[PDB]
Amino acid sequence: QEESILQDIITRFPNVVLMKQTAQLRAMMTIIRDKETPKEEFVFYADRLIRLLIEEALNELPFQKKEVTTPLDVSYHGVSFYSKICGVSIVRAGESMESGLRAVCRGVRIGKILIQRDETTAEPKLIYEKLPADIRERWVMLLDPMCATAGSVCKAIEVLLRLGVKEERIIFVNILAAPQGIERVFKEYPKVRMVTAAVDICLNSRYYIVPGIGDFGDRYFGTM
Amino acid sequence: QEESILQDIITRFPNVVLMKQTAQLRAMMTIIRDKETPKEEFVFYADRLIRLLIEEALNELPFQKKEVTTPLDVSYHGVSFYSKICGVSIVRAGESMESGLRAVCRGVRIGKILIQRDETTAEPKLIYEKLPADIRERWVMLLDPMCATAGSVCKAIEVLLRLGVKEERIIFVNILAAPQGIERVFKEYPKVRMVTAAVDICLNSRYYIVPGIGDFGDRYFGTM
Amino acid sequence: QEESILQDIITRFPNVVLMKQTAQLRAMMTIIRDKETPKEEFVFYADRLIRLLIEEALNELPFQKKEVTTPLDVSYHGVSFYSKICGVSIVRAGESMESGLRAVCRGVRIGKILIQRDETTAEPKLIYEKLPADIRERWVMLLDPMCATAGSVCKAIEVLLRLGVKEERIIFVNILAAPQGIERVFKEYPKVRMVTAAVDICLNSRYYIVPGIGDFGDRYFGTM
Amino acid sequence: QEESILQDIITRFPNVVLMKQTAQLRAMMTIIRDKETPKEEFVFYADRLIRLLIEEALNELPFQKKEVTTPLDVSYHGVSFYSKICGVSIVRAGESMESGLRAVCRGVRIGKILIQRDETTAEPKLIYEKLPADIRERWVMLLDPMCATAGSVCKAIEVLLRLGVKEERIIFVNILAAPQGIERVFKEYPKVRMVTAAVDICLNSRYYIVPGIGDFGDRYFGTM
Numbered sequence A, B, C, D: 001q002e003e004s005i006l007q008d009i010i011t012r013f014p015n016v017v018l019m020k021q022t023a024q025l026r027a028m029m030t031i032i033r034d035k036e037t038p039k040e041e042f043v044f045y046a047d048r049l050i051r052l053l054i055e056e057a058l059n060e061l062p063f064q065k066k067e068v069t070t071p072l073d074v075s076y077h078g079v080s081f082y083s084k085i086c087g088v089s090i091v092r093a094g095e096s097m098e099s100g101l102r103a104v105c106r107g108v109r110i111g112k113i114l115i116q117r118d119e120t121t122a123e124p125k126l127i128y129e130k131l132p133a134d135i136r137e138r139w140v141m142l143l144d145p146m147c148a149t150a151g152s153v154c155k156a157i158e159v160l161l162r163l164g165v166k167e168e169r170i171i172f173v174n175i176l177a178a179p180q181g182i183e184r185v186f187k188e189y190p191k192v193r194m195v196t197a198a199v200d201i202c203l204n205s206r207y208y209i210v211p212g213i214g215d216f217g218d219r220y221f222g223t224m
């Protein structure tokens, strides 16, 4: 059923890459998913998993072939990545991915976007934002652990687009998604790329994925 | 070329586990092999590459299965890793990987084995060792980044078998190997697992792998 | 003249703790005060200094004596810390410090506060906040790299106080201050402690500290 | 008692540098000294202390003045550290300190020296060494957590001197020392510098420092 669900997302949206479901990724997901998990532990594995997710997403950047010469003085043919990029996090749950992103891309520029779903309706509203100036010319690693309704990421995307970011240069990095948020995301912005660790089954009346993980941001920041 | 070699090696040696040759992987490999790379950059990228490799490798241990219930108060079918392990680094080069093991496995016990081959005779002698008392009952991640002749890792496997470690409980973690190294290891110890990041074409007259990386230990620690 | 400002500040405000001015500490500040330093470098050293700075601030927590016995089976007279604490960051600049608090306090609870000065006038207004539930009972490490006029940091405290946090349980962690701000902080909230690394002589019309460091937040996040 | 102690040595040996005995340090020492603290923790806290210890030693190096210009387009008179350095670990316990060193000094060259006391004679002898080719041109941070009798470090020093390093250019970085140890190092190489974090009362009948911490290397690497 998971299977059947993984593959359908997969045969269905060529734009998503599903991180390889190794025994290890699964163990990590287990610890994180578990309610019994203390904060010290949760942060540790959450951080552990995030480095892996990023390392994977980084493969969507573009690269050229580069050839070098070894100390043995022979030629090796490889590649290099030349793109200007930056990471944008959606406050606050997205903030927990910055570190991972910064651990591998030393000094990478970081934008932050604050979105709040309206009280009356629940239309999502852009509250605050600080983005690199020339973000129009960069590839963007859009950071957000959970993808329920996709309400927020979609808003985030709306704004990035507004500023001139090309849809095709946006890499949505995520941990846990819902078939439904996946669908809305590609229905509005088919050109984006989305890299995820996991797809769960359904969404709750409170719009929490399930089986899910609970409130990620509170769990990670300890604002339980 | 490389694809063939890769295929055959993969075909005659089923306990080899070559890492996913992603574009990021290659790129790291690219910077690490370059003769011009400054020491600070070499180290930084080695560690990065190293972290991914350890993560690959941990997938070789046995894992339980575990059902957990989430904050959504429903259950999750996870997995848990229940074995007892340790890291054994082959001094000095293998030491470069310890940190990576420790980054992912906090407090993991670490054993060290200094093998050195004799000046005239050229043979590997055991010169220094300091291991965990119960290594007999553990899974060992043997760490040594280069594998050319397999001359020394073979001596390290021998002493571990004399302390009573099970052969099939040894996981040999490596960055770069030569086909000949591979053949040897598996000829003497068919029951080990080996996880590697790259397999080079062959070795030169001086028994250095090529196109290779040079002297890993020397480039990592700064003694050349 | 530095000394002169350092001491006059030091004798007037019993509650401020200045870090010992070491050649290395000054070497870090030199690098980060300089306009020519690259993002990757600025971030490195800012992270470096921050860690020393928290380590310092943490000695303002209360601790009990504890006696243990050494592996030698002789007793040693320790001094355990045991109070509940949490860090609270002032978005955005302050957030650069949480990583340091987390480096040293595994899974420490983190609270975020977003305050924006008011356009027409100039009063700092609470834009958004997310704190631990039981914060009234914790000691708080309030983080904000800079302290010009102190408006923002007098607002964050105001809200803290209203949430019930006891004033003498608040530790203000700061890299750089202007006397002026140091003055408003204590006139308003005499009972709180402030730990800082440097005090600069003056403030400019745009409210920047001089010779100071420029806009900390953007140089660290690279939105400059 | 202890105070009479730090007093005599600080008085008799002008090149010793004890770190500030702050509450946390004590606290830290308290956890690492306890016989019931588990491996994961012992390492976490040892690393934490070691990092402060190294920041401290880094101050022993020569430094230049440097005036920079801040973004406020004004001058700042900093300092800069210009010497060539490298760390040299006394294998195996000294190895635990490399990481600290490498966390603050990226890419520093690291030399290693393994010295053992003969099984019968007790004489300490050089067993293995790999060091930067130009160590004589550098300032040496010598790490060894423990200094009892000082047999080991004295021998270490001796080989660096045979290699040509300047006695005055060696900074001996230590976690715990016994008076006997200090007096010996000084009688023998009065020109070196020693930065330590604590000085214990004495040696057991068996040559262990008390109250001590026991075998560091074993508690650190997990060989206990």
Ligand SMILES: O=c1[nH]cc(F)c(=O)[nH]1
Binding pocket: A093, A146, A147, A148, A149, A207, A208, A209, A210, A212, A213, A214, A215, A216, A217
């Ligand atoms: O933090 C969360 N956001 C959205 C979700 F659907 C969920 O489970 N958790």
Ligand SMILES: O=c1[nH]cc(F)c(=O)[nH]1
Binding pocket: B093, B146, B147, B148, B149, B207, B208, B209, B212, B213, B214, B215, B216, B217
């Ligand atoms: O460090 C190394 N040892 C052996 C080799 F063959 C090689 O290439 N590198």
Ligand SMILES: O=c1[nH]cc(F)c(=O)[nH]1
Binding pocket: C146, C148, C207, C208, C209, C210, C212, C213, C214, C215, C216, C217, C218
């Ligand atoms: O980042 C900064 N903002 C405001 C200041 F006054 C200052 O010195 N730095």
Ligand SMILES: O=c1[nH]cc(F)c(=O)[nH]1
Binding pocket: D146, D147, D148, D149, D207, D208, D209, D210, D212, D213, D214, D215, D216, D217
């Ligand atoms: O590990 C140790 N080495 C040397 C000592 F003197 C001691 O007490 N502990």
